[PDB]
């Protein structure tokens, strides 16, 4: 086991306000394989200026996915108050074969700050946070969303400049509003931009510290960080699991401008991941300085046959989901 730093000294947790209705929004961004949306580049071979038929793990054509969105939290004047989150922690999904994630999709455009539906602002990219594991159950007061035994946490930190991946037991804390205490509604992470994101000094531990307020980290077997370059470009994240471990994919390190996903880590996680949930984040802004944070989209992977169209430099820029409709199947059979 590994040392992951200090426990929280806080005697209670920040109060968390769940209002699903403010987060129920239809901003559809479905998979378009003709733009190679959500394609994990096939592993073990390279191709160029050619079209192959391939059987791998892909999201299917036209899948709307599940949309998630993070919001600024309550404020009064210049005083951050309760957190503002959707009902994500109780919504435990099934990992199956894994999933890919469309990150920062609506950036640069304008949208709502969620917590105040009339206020609008320029939308900025925000990275998603995940909790994955093999055993789920209830918290003490009946609520779903508690992960047992070792749990894989994927938690961006450093105002979007870092990804932390760690695999430990999550011991719920007992203070007021904590998962093992009174008036528990949901756990969340947060950071406070006034103190945590002043230029030159991004706090690389601000989100972890907030996580550490709801759970004590115990029997941790690893904790990795992955530096992330600050920009506002559309990018894709993927995760799968084999007997060799959990595999993390990103477009960001190889094909930043195209979206092809390449493996950038193998985590030594050998228990089968059967469940995951999205960890709600809330940003402790003051009222005047709220921002809009781009929704992200999570699409499940299935075994599918695709036509993959490799450009000359070797990247996939067009594809066809053979099972999509009759016309696409006609294109597939016409290459055999």
């Amino acid at each position: 086991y590994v040392d992951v730093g200090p426990d929280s000294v806080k005697s209670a947790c920040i109060e968390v306000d769940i209002q699903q209705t403010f987060f129920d929004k239809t901003w559809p961004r479905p998979i378009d394989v003709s733009k190679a949306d959500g394609i994990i580049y096939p592993q073990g071979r390279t191709y160029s200026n050619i079209t192959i038929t391939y059987q791998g793990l892909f999201p299917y054509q036209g899948d709307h996915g599940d949309m998630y969105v993070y919001s600024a939290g309550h404020a009064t004047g210049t005083t951050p108050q309760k957190l503002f989150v959707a009902n994500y922690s109780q919504d435990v999904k099934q990992f199956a074969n894994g999933f890919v994630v469309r990150i920062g999709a609506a950036a640069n455009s304008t949208g709502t700050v969620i917590i105040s539906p009339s206020t609008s602002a320029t939308i900025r990219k925000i990275y998603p946070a995940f909790m994955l594991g093999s055993s789920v159950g209830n918290f003490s007061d009946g609520k779903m969303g508690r992960f047992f035994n070792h749990t894989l946490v994927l938690l961006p930190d450093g105002c979007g400049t870092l990804l932390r991946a760690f695999y430990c037991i999550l011991e719920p804390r007992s203070g007021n509003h904590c998962p093992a205490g009174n008036s528990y509604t949901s756990f969340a992470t947060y950071h406070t931009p006034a103190t945590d994101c002043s230029d030159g000094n991004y706090n690389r531990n601000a989100s972890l510290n907030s996580f550490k307020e709801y759970f004590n980290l115990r029997n941790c077997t690893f904790m990795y960080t992955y530096n992330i370059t600050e920009d506002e470009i559309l990018e894709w994240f993927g995760i799968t699991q084999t007997a060799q471990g959990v595999h993390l994919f990103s477009s960001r390190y190889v094909d930043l401008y195209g979206g092809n996903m390449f493996q950038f880590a193998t985590l030594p996680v050998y228990d089968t991941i059967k469940y995951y949930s999205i960890i709600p984040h809330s940003i402790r802004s003051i009222q005047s300085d709220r921002k809009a944070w781009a929704a992200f989209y999570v699409y499940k992977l299935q075994p599918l046959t695709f036509l993959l169209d490799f450009s000359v430099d070797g990247y996939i820029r067009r594809a066809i989901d053979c099972g999509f409709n009759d016309l696409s199947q006609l294109h597939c059979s016409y290459e055999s």
């Epitope: 590994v2 000294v9 005697s11 011991e171 007992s174 531990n205 115990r218 029997n219």
Partner: antibody, heavy 123, light 111 residues
């Protein structure tokens, strides 16, 4: 001789009732902001009483109910020092006060203690 | 809010005999496979020293005559066989949840 990690509390104090006193705890030999500093009151007829603790990374604090008001915990990163200020002093506060470091993994214990600050409140 | 009880208050023991100190918590101090109970030894004019952490682990330099044991709410420190250097006061503390608390202490004297 000496060990690598040391907590060196400030000197001893004699003050009048109603005063306040502010004692320091200067750490050395470890990364100052990854270890919480806890404070403990020791008076002859109560043993050890936990007061509270501070996280030097973001200034967060915790107190036990009997001390939420009497004590105020602060830290300085540059000097690697932790401070405890006691206000509204009565005779019931004459005691030796300790700072100690919580070791994180493993143990989760008070692995290292300062030598104690003697505070006396004479009527 | 866990409260620690130590017994006895003081005890005197002959060289080479066994000393047993008990600690009881008002509420279980067990989670995640640990018992968040620690023992400190304190000599006069000095600060406490950590002896045992997480119920039964000896800190480095602490001889094996100290044996810590127990789980949940009831713990005991045994010293066997006691040497002249073991005259101290022993304190238990839990770290299960905040606020942390210590026991009253047990003063051990040797003949």
């Amino acid at each position: 001789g000496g060990s690598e990690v040391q907590l060196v509390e400030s000197g001893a104090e004699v003050v009048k009732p109603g005063a306040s006193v502010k004692m320091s705890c200067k750490a050395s030999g470890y990364p100052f902001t990854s270890y919480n500093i806890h404070w403990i009151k020791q008076t002859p007829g109560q043993g050890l009483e936990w007061i509270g603790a501070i996280y030097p990374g973001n200034g967060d604090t915790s107190y036990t109910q009997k001390f939420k008001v009497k004590a105020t915990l602060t830290s300085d990163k540059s000097s690697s020092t932790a401070y405890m200020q006691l206000s509204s002093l009565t005779s019931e506060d004459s005691a030796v006060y300790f700072c100690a470091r919580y070791g994180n993994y493993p143990s989760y214990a008070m692995d290292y203690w300062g030598q104690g600050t003697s505070v006396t409140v004479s009527s | 809010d866990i409260v620690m009880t130590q017994s006895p208050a003081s005890l005197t023991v002959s060289l080479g005999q066994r000393a047993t100190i008990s600690c009881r918590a008002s509420k279980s101090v067990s989670a995640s496979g640990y018992n968040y109970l620690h023992w400190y030894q304190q000599r006069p004019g000095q600060p406490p020293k950590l002896l045992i952490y997480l119920a039964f682990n000896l800190e480095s330099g602490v001889p094996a005559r100290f044996n810590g044991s127990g789980s949940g709410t009831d713990f005991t420190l045994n010293i066997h066989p006691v040497e002249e250097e073991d005259a101290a006061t022993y304190y238990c503390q839990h770290s299960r949840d905040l606020p942390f608390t210590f026991g009253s202490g047990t003063k051990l004297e040797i003949k």
